[model samples]
Target: GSLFQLKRETDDLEQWISEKELVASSPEMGQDFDHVTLLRDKFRDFARETGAIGQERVDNVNAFIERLIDAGHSEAATIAEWKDGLNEMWADLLELIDTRMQLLAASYDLHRYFYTGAEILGLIDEKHRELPHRVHTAFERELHLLGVQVQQFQDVATRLQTAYAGEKAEAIQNKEQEVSAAWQALLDACA
Candidate 1:
């Protein structure tokens, strides 16, 4: 759909031109060469679109091409001078058409490229509808997992402090018991 219309128009021109060639044994003057006439019409529109020329100049250019191309046709009764003129016009027209088609292709490419950002943005919006705050949820789960690691470290520190406090209390109790036994012996010997 992106380039369908333009491509079909070009295809139609090619097909028609090919058919016209098969039937060109007796070419008419500019007025009778239906093939080039149709091509020029299309080229005229394209020229306008691409800023190649204006409306007034196209009719003049078409007439000029017609006068030259008439020489190539048998309808002109084929004089050497006209035949030469037709040949030159044919080459020039071929070059002109080739460049115009190249321009058409590049224009289509640029148009497609220009719309890609919008298309991608649309896709992202569509994806968001399905997922719903996916990034926020993803980060939320990660932080919770990290919080668990922190909780485990806190548990270890608490156990370490409790173990050290129990050892300290036991050492103090053992020293007091030794002093109490010494006091009992002194009290017995003195009286």
Candidate 2:
């Protein structure tokens, strides 16, 4: 009965890991890292729990196997095979969990980059709208601050490009170009 229960638990762990992978790769994402940060923490918590639960379960199975072996049961060796299989599954589960966490973290950063880029672009538009009425010095000050903001965005985008590539990286590059162009246009207009 214990062996059967252990097998069931192992299967459940596998299924749970599969479901988490789906969540990590889901297209539906929070608009910003602020909102998604909790999800990452939750994944971290889950990983901790998985380790605890898996260790306890494996210990319990081993104890049972020890009892069977002490009793000189012929099936002890055969039943020990299940313990090996469970350990393998547990190792695979932990790896999957860690991989999913990496994916989730990267995905959140990717989403944040796009979200913050759009936000910065909107601020630029607002500044452009106000450009005509502002005194030269005031506009220059605002432009200086805006330059800092844009630089921050570019730094993260550059870092992200290294982590991701293909169309996704190209898309982020395009966004960075659009933001830079807007900032330049503001400078030219104000100059």
Task: Provide the overall lDDT of each model, using Cα atoms, as 2-decimal numbers.
Answer: 0.40, 0.76
Error of 1 at 155 (Å): 54
Number of the top-ranking candidate, with lDDT as the measure = 2
99 Cα displacement, candidate 1 (Å)? 1.0
Task: Score candidate 1 by lDDT.
Answer: 0.40
What's the alpha carbon RMSD for model 1? 33.8
- Cα error, candidate 1, residue 43 (Å): 5.5
Query: What lDDT tens digits, residue by residue, belong to model 1 across residues 1-191?
Result: 22244235334544543443333322221322344445445655644543342223333433444564564644333333433443454444445555655544433333332243234334333433443254877645753543353344334333334433566435433433433344344334334
After TM-score superposition, the amount by which residue 21's alpha carbon in candidate 1 deviates from its true location, in angstroms, is 18
Could you tell me how far off, in angstroms, the CA of residue 94 lies in candidate 2 after the best superposition? 1.4
Write one digit per residue (lDDT tens) for candidate 2, span 1-191: 66677567656755665564554454433456766776777777877876786678667766777787788878777777766776676676667777777877887888888889999999999988874543878777877988999999999989998986799889999999999999899878776
Q: Cα lDDT for residue 107, model 2?
A: 74
**Candidate 1 lDDT trough over 10 residues, lowest sum:** 23-32
Off by over 4 Å in 2: 1-51, 66-76, 132-142
